Amino acid sequence: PQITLWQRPIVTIKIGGQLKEALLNTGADDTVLEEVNLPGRWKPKLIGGIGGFVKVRQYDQVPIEICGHKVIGTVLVGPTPANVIGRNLMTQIGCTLNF
C-alpha cells in the first residue's frame, strides 16, 4: 500500500498482543514504544543525546505486525512522546522511499 505524506504517516501495529498507533518515522534509526510489558529478557540502552540521554529497554526478535505485515525486530521500550517505527523495522517490512 502506498502512503502519501500529506499527513503524518501513522499506521497501526500489533505488539505484545495489544494494538497501538505508530508513526512511520524514517529519520529514526530505532523503534521506540510507549511503556509496554513484552516478555523475554532485554538490555538497558540509552538513546536521544540532545538534552541528556533517555534510557530505555532493548528487546530482540520481539515479533511485531505492521498493516498485516507480520515481522520480527528490535523494539526499544520506554518513554517517547509517540510510538515510532524506525528504519530498522521499516526495512523488515519492505517499506521504501519513492518519488
Residues that bind ligand DMQ (CB under 6 A): 23, 25, 27-30, 32, 47-49, 81-82, 84, 86
**Burial class of residue 4, CB neighbours in 10 A (0-12, 13-18, 19+):** exposed
What the block records as the C-alpha cell of 84 is 515510532
The partner in contact with residue 2, picked from ligand DMQ, a copy of itself, none with C-beta cut-offs of 5 to 8 angstroms by kind, is: a copy of itself
Q: What are phi and psi of 93, to 5 degrees?
A: -105, -10
Residue among 14 and 42 whose Cβ is closer to a copy of itself: 14
Positions in the binding site for a copy of itself (CB under 8 A) = 1-9, 23-29, 50-51, 66-67, 69, 81, 84, 87, 90-91, 93-99
In whole angstroms, give the CA distance from residue 22 to residue 71. 15
Shortest approach of ligand DMQ to residue 30 CB, angstroms?
3
